[PDB]
Amino acid sequence: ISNRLSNQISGLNVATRNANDGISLAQTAEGALQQSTNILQRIRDLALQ
Amino acid sequence: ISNRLSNQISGLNVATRNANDGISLAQTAEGALQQSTNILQRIRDLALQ
């Protein structure tokens, strides 16, 4: 049970890494879409002008 | 009965030797498989990465 269990623990650590990399990825997507958002707001403003 | 019996005793001593050599052999197998185990854990970790 200790070999399988240890292997599980290691997989869990790697999963912490992978999930956190996912948070950072989705963060990048968020920021890029903040800028596209600000732009498309701006384009709306020009249509209103 | 003493000749046969003594021969038996000697065989028993040789058997102590042989069984202990077996413990040491299976020990070698154990260690080698500790290292292969650590490796195959590692390979699992990389598949998870």
Curated annotation (Swiss-Prot), chains A, B:
Entry PTM: Phosphorylated on tyrosine residue(s).
Highest taxon, organism lineage: Bacteria
Subcellular location: Secreted; Bacterial flagellum
Cysteine pairs bridged by disulfides in the record: none
Described purpose of this protein according to its UniProt entry: Flagellin is the subunit protein which polymerizes to form the filaments of bacterial flagella.
UniProt record similarity statement: Belongs to the bacterial flagellin family.
Protein name, entry field: B-type flagellin
Lineage: Bacteria, Pseudomonadati, Pseudomonadota, Gammaproteobacteria, Pseudomonadales
Gene: fliC
Residues of the full protein shown: 50 to 98 of 488
